[PDB]
Design an enzyme around this catalytic site. Structure first.
Site, mmCIF file in Angstrom:
data_model
loop_
_atom_site.group_PDB
_atom_site.id
_atom_site.type_symbol
_atom_site.label_atom_id
_atom_site.label_comp_id
_atom_site.label_asym_id
_atom_site.label_seq_id
_atom_site.Cartn_x
_atom_site.Cartn_y
_atom_site.Cartn_z
ATOM 1 N N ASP A 109 0.748 -1.267 0.000
ATOM 2 C CA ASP A 109 0.000 0.000 0.000
ATOM 3 C C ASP A 109 0.779 1.318 0.000
ATOM 4 O O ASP A 109 0.174 2.388 0.064
ATOM 5 C CB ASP A 109 -0.995 0.052 1.159
ATOM 6 C CG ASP A 109 -2.188 -0.842 0.938
ATOM 7 O OD1 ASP A 109 -2.877 -0.683 -0.092
ATOM 8 O OD2 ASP A 109 -2.426 -1.711 1.803
ATOM 9 N N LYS A 140 3.349 1.824 -5.051
ATOM 10 C CA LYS A 140 4.144 1.346 -6.189
ATOM 11 C C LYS A 140 3.405 1.296 -7.502
ATOM 12 O O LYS A 140 3.949 1.703 -8.546
ATOM 13 C CB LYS A 140 4.684 -0.061 -5.907
ATOM 14 C CG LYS A 140 5.469 -0.184 -4.593
ATOM 15 C CD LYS A 140 5.974 -1.608 -4.353
ATOM 16 C CE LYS A 140 4.847 -2.585 -3.994
ATOM 17 N NZ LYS A 140 4.183 -2.349 -2.686
ATOM 18 N N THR A 141 2.172 0.798 -7.470
ATOM 19 C CA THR A 141 1.415 0.681 -8.695
ATOM 20 C C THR A 141 0.909 2.036 -9.184
ATOM 21 O O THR A 141 0.893 2.292 -10.412
ATOM 22 C CB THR A 141 0.297 -0.377 -8.559
ATOM 23 O OG1 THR A 141 0.895 -1.657 -8.209
ATOM 24 C CG2 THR A 141 -0.486 -0.503 -9.875
ATOM 25 N N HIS A 161 2.795 -7.162 -0.754
ATOM 26 C CA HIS A 161 2.220 -8.053 0.270
ATOM 27 C C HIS A 161 3.173 -9.212 0.619
ATOM 28 O O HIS A 161 3.811 -9.807 -0.253
ATOM 29 C CB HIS A 161 0.859 -8.603 -0.195
ATOM 30 C CG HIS A 161 0.057 -9.215 0.907
ATOM 31 N ND1 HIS A 161 0.437 -10.373 1.549
ATOM 32 C CD2 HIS A 161 -1.082 -8.806 1.516
ATOM 33 C CE1 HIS A 161 -0.433 -10.653 2.503
ATOM 34 N NE2 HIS A 161 -1.363 -9.719 2.505
HETATM 35 N N1 LIG Z 1 -3.074 10.105 -0.365
HETATM 36 C C1 LIG Z 1 -2.391 9.341 -1.228
HETATM 37 N N2 LIG Z 1 -2.775 8.065 -1.451
HETATM 38 C C2 LIG Z 1 -1.987 7.441 -2.370
HETATM 39 C C3 LIG Z 1 -0.903 7.954 -3.057
HETATM 40 N N3 LIG Z 1 -0.358 7.003 -3.899
HETATM 41 C C4 LIG Z 1 -1.110 5.954 -3.731
HETATM 42 N N4 LIG Z 1 -2.129 6.149 -2.824
HETATM 43 C C5 LIG Z 1 -3.173 5.202 -2.449
HETATM 44 O O1 LIG Z 1 -2.777 4.210 -1.520
HETATM 45 C C6 LIG Z 1 -3.333 2.931 -1.941
HETATM 46 C C7 LIG Z 1 -2.287 1.931 -2.370
HETATM 47 O O2 LIG Z 1 -1.774 2.326 -3.656
HETATM 48 P P1 LIG Z 1 -1.129 1.299 -4.682
HETATM 49 O O3 LIG Z 1 -0.474 2.078 -5.775
HETATM 50 O O4 LIG Z 1 -2.117 0.261 -5.118
HETATM 51 O O5 LIG Z 1 -0.067 0.618 -3.700
HETATM 52 P P2 LIG Z 1 1.048 -0.509 -3.956
HETATM 53 O O6 LIG Z 1 2.298 -0.067 -3.251
HETATM 54 O O7 LIG Z 1 1.210 -0.699 -5.437
HETATM 55 N N5 LIG Z 1 0.375 -1.802 -3.184
HETATM 56 P P3 LIG Z 1 0.740 -3.424 -3.333
HETATM 57 O O8 LIG Z 1 1.882 -3.709 -2.454
HETATM 58 O O9 LIG Z 1 -0.522 -4.227 -3.239
HETATM 59 O O10 LIG Z 1 1.267 -3.520 -4.746
HETATM 60 C C8 LIG Z 1 -4.429 3.275 -2.948
HETATM 61 O O11 LIG Z 1 -5.679 3.533 -2.334
HETATM 62 C C9 LIG Z 1 -3.880 4.521 -3.628
HETATM 63 O O12 LIG Z 1 -4.841 5.397 -4.190
HETATM 64 C C10 LIG Z 1 -0.509 9.303 -2.826
HETATM 65 O O13 LIG Z 1 0.413 9.918 -3.364
HETATM 66 N N6 LIG Z 1 -1.323 9.939 -1.870
HETATM 67 MG MG LIG Z 2 0.746 -2.578 -6.319
#
Ligand SMILES: Nc1nc2c(ncn2[C@@H]2O[C@H](COP(=O)(O)OP(=O)(O)NP(=O)(O)O)[C@@H](O)[C@H]2O)c(=O)[nH]1
Ligand SMILES: [Mg+2]
Length: 403
Positions: free
Chosen positions: A19, A22-23, A83
């Site tokens: 979370d 990264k994505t 994860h």
């Molecule tokens: N406030 C805020 N939320 C963010 C920001 N970047 C990502 N998020 C949020 O935090 C959550 C996780 O983002 P995501 O890109 O899916 O995370 P990840 O690191 O790729 N997760 P995973 O380890 O499952 O791959 C989402 O709800 C996303 O909108 C940011 O710059 N600001």
């Molecule tokens: Mg991700």
């Protein structure tokens, strides 16, 4: 279309705790560079976390490969899961990286997989790291931001990366992404959030050097994934480690099986673009004739016929993680059977301690013998990780092949 080489190619990717963003950062990179280079294909959030199981769990599960470019280089980017249940796919993704972008949430700071990912990235050969401190839009206290930065640099130093020198860009992947949706043509200098993404790209361009590629050694490509392209055949994907491969070449499928399979390459593509020749460094899809997706699998390697001999027994120098680093609480004995990770290979092995050494404790630095339950392509000096029971327990180097 056919892939046209015009500039140097580098493989990067995103690692970090679940979370932390990264994505979201990955999608932002495609939108931002596309406003400047029409050749870049945009990828939104859902185009990357697109699998049914990913939509079901609400997390990234599979590594995703996206392409983008700056004025200086062409990039293949691998987005990895944060994860803990999918550490296995993160390792396979990191094994394709020339440099990594460590995403850290400014609002949460360094978490358990922030540390584990740094440690694993090193063991699979990632040489450089650039940090993107994400979600700063949620932190108004400047002191906190400075604190997280300090914590992250400290963490990097613990694992032999130049923590004090790495570029640490502070930004918001989400706000940059929203902006590009509102105006896909937003250029540099126009918006604050987008500019921070450009700052990251500049750091990638300048801090991660273009690797010295060995295109004159025998062809070797660790397989990261396998699938079927209906009406075309079986495709094995991965980053070419050394050598080259051309349509019509014969290759051997080495490892994980009792015997080695030989087949012919009938196609090569990089990001759905046709290539007449794949060279060291390229991240490609190799079409294999006469083999089904159940005959090739992740962890095997494609290699010039006769250049590699799979092994099962070796001596290794190993560091066993302390409890404090997410390692084991208690020591283990001869007969311990953890999983070993070499590049994109994941295989069970039996630890055989030499006489006089009857137990190994966390924090210990030992040398012992490992016997794998399946043959795999190995080399002395090859680094590896050891995991067992959902945790990384040790990091080692192969010091001598025994058989
Ligand atoms: N406030 C805020 N939320 C963010 C920001 N970047 C990502 N998020 C949020 O935090 C959550 C996780 O983002 P995501 O890109 O899916 O995370 P990840 O690191 O790729 N997760 P995973 O380890 O499952 O791959 C989402 O709800 C996303 O909108 C940011 O710059 N600001
Ligand atoms: Mg991700």
């Amino acid at each position: 279309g056919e892939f046209i080489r015009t500039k140097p190619h580098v493989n990067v990717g995103t690692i970090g705790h679940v979370d932390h963003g990264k994505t979201t950062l990955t999608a932002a990179l495609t939108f931002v560079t596309a406003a400047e280079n029409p050749n870049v294909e945009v990828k939104d959030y859902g185009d990357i976390d697109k699998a049914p199981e990913e939509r079901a769990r609400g997390i990234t599960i599979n590594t995703a490969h996206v392409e983008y470019e700056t004025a200086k280089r062409h990039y293949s980017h691998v987005d990895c899961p944060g994860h803990a249940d999918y550490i296995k796919n993160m390792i396979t993704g990191a094994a394709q990286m020339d440099g990594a972008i460590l995403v850290v949430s400014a609002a949460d700071g360094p978490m358990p997989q922030t540390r584990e990912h740094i440690l694993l990235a090193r063991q699979v050969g990632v040489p450089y790291i650039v940090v993107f401190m994400n979600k700063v839009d949620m932190v108004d206290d400047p002191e906190l931001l400075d604190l997280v930065e300090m914590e992250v640099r400290d963490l990097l130093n613990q694992y032999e990366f130049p923590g004090d020198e790495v570029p640490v860009i502070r930004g918001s992947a989400l706000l940059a992404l929203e902006q590009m949706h509102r105006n896909p043509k937003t250029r540099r200098g126009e918006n604050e959030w987008v500019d921070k993404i450009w700052e990251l790209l500049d750091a990638i361009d300048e801090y991660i050097p273009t690797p010295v590629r060995d295109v004159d050694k025998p062809f070797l490509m660790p397989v990261e994934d396998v699938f079927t392209i209906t009406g075309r055949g079986t495709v094995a994907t991965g980053r070419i480690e050394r050598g080259k491969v051309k349509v019509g070449d014969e290759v051997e499928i080495v490892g994980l099986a009792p015997e080695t399979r030989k087949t012919v390459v009938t196609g090569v593509e990089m990001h759905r673009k046709t290539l007449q020749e794949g060279i060291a460094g390229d991240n490609v899809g190799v079409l294999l004739r006469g083999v089904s997706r159940e005959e090739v699998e992740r962890g095997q390697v494609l290699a010039k016929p006769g250049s590699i001999t799979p092994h099962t027994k070796f001596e290794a120098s190993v560091y066993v993680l302390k409890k404090e680093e997410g390692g084991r609480h208690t020591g283990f004995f001869s007969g311990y059977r953890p999983q070993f990770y070499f590049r994109t290979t994941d295989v069970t092995g039996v630890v055989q301690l030499p006489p006089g050494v009857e137990m190994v404790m966390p924090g210990d630095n030992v040398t012992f013998t490992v016997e794998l339950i399946k043959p795999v392509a190995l080399e002395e000096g090859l680094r590896f990780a050891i995991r067992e029971g959902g945790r990384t327990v040790g990091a080692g180097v192969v010091t001598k092949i025994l058989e």
